[PDB]
């Protein structure tokens, strides 16, 4: 929807065998962000790599900690930070850094209180509107049968529904195929 | 070193880690050790001549 260029960076991608990679990675990423268009940057799993390990015995990665500290430093003491934004996401709230609060740093905080069904049915309808489906749907069964499922899992339900629809002999997707797929893959 | 030692004064010469350097060897590729142990034998004869 942003229509811009999208990038993909994960947590373990910042962890390597070499040392001092953090500074080079950050400076290079900011260099590409400086040279190129205002694209979209999204990183995931900042909680696992941001663990400060309360237990004092041992652990393998202290690097992404100071990498994050340096990232915040460049997101604070630098005027160019008004340039292209970097989106971060955390899976678990067990680990949180109090120094992440700032305009340049993490600002928006949204907690998800058990997302509803009908909305998932809506976005599923938006995703499946391209495929050919018999236009009779109660939506009640498919909304009710979905509990603690991802969006990718719903798309997987659609794909699974398209899988057996090929060997059923029908050229058009039916209603029960959705819930059948739900009970199939999940 | 020996001639400047005998030229200058009654200097005191110290040698450390003889176990690794003076160890005998066979192979020609490692024969450099045999060469330097022959150097050791040379200065051994020289210090035999340095007895008085």
């Amino acid at each position: 929807q942003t229509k811009a260029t999208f990038l993909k960076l994960a947590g373990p991608q910042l962890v390597q065998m070499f040392i001092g990679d953090g500074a080079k990675l950050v400076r290079d990423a900011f260099a590409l962000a400086k040279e190129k268009a205002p694209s979209i940057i999204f990183i995931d799993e900042l909680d696992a790599i941001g663990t400060k390990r309360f237990d004092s015995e041992k652990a393998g990665d202290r690097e992404v900690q100071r990498t994050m500290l340096e990232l915040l430093n460049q997101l604070d003491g630098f005027q160019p930070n008004t340039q292209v934004k970097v989106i971060a996401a955390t899976n678990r709230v067990d680990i949180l850094d109090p120094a992440l609060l700032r305009s340049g740093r993490l600002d928006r905080k949204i907690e998800f209180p058990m997302p509803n069904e009908e909305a998932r049915a809506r976005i599923m309808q938006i995703h499946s509107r391209k495929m050919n489906v018999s236009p009779d749907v109660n939506y009640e069964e498919l909304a009710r049968c979905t509990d603690d499922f991802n969006g990718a899992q719903c798309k997987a339900v659609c794909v699974e529904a398209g899988m057996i629809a090929l060997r059923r002999g029908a050229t058009e997707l039916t209603h029960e195929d959705y819930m059948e797929g739900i009970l199939e893959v999940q | 070193v020996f001639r400047l030692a005998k030229e200058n004064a009654p200097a005191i010469i110290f040698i450390d880690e003889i176990d690794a350097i003076a160890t005998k060897r066979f192979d020609a590729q490692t024969g450099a050790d045999r060469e330097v142990q022959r150097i050791l034998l040379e200065l051994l004869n020289q210090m035999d001549g340095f007895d008085q």
Partner: protein
Amino acid sequence: GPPGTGKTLLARAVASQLDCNFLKVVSSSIVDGESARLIREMFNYARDHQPCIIFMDEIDAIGGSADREIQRTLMELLNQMDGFDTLHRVKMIMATNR
């Protein structure tokens, strides 16, 4: 800084004001016992350039044979800070939480 934050904003205000130079010291230079020569190298650069100002943020992490190497690094820090150097010029600033 136990009651909140914003000290880094003041440090940034001073840094943007004069600061006499631009320098930053990471919290943990260890993971970068081979980091000792790196610390001595950084301090060697600190001796190279006479004016210096040190900014250290979140030092409470490093303040805490696993513990033995930590104590050894602390002893190295003591040896370096209490060694022979001129501190009348170089300035150090430490930021923390609790």
